[PDB]
């Protein structure tokens, strides 16, 4: 925790998503990484 996310003001391809997931795992844990992945999946599908 305690690591505030950076405002990614750019286009988001697969590389950016993989980088974001890795950062989230490194800073937040494995269940917040799971939550983030589910939220991104929902947003992308919508």
């Amino acid at each position: 925790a305690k690591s505030a996310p950076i405002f990614r003001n750019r286009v988001i391809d697969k590389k950016q998503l993989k980088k974001l997931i890795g950062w989230t795992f490194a800073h937040y844990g494995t269940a917040k990484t799971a939550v983030v992945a589910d939220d991104l999946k929902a947003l992308g599908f919508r």
Binding site: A34, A37, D38, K41, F45
Partner: protein, 122 residues
Amino acid sequence: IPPDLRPMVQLRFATSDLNDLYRRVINRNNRLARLQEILAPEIIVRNEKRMLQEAVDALIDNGRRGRTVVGANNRPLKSLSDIIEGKQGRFRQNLLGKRVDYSGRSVIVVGPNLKIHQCGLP
């Protein structure tokens, strides 16, 4: 080998190849004993001994040394060595991998509303 490891079940009777191999061994052994009891000509006794050796060979490992003992159809009989070797052998078919209980199998479709730790089971 114990009889339940070479089952002779009734569907017709389905028999393991070990029964036929063992019968060959027993038949040749009994004939050899009879020949040794009646003082048969030496060539006949020697040929029977050769036959007994070949029958025991086919029992231990069919086709390793001589010709392969085929069955009713022209297929090799599965001897003792053929049981414990190969991808269909005992080790790889029943000891390192088994068919298990409490198992199912079905086609998979995509569940988009499920969570990553969940699955949809019919």
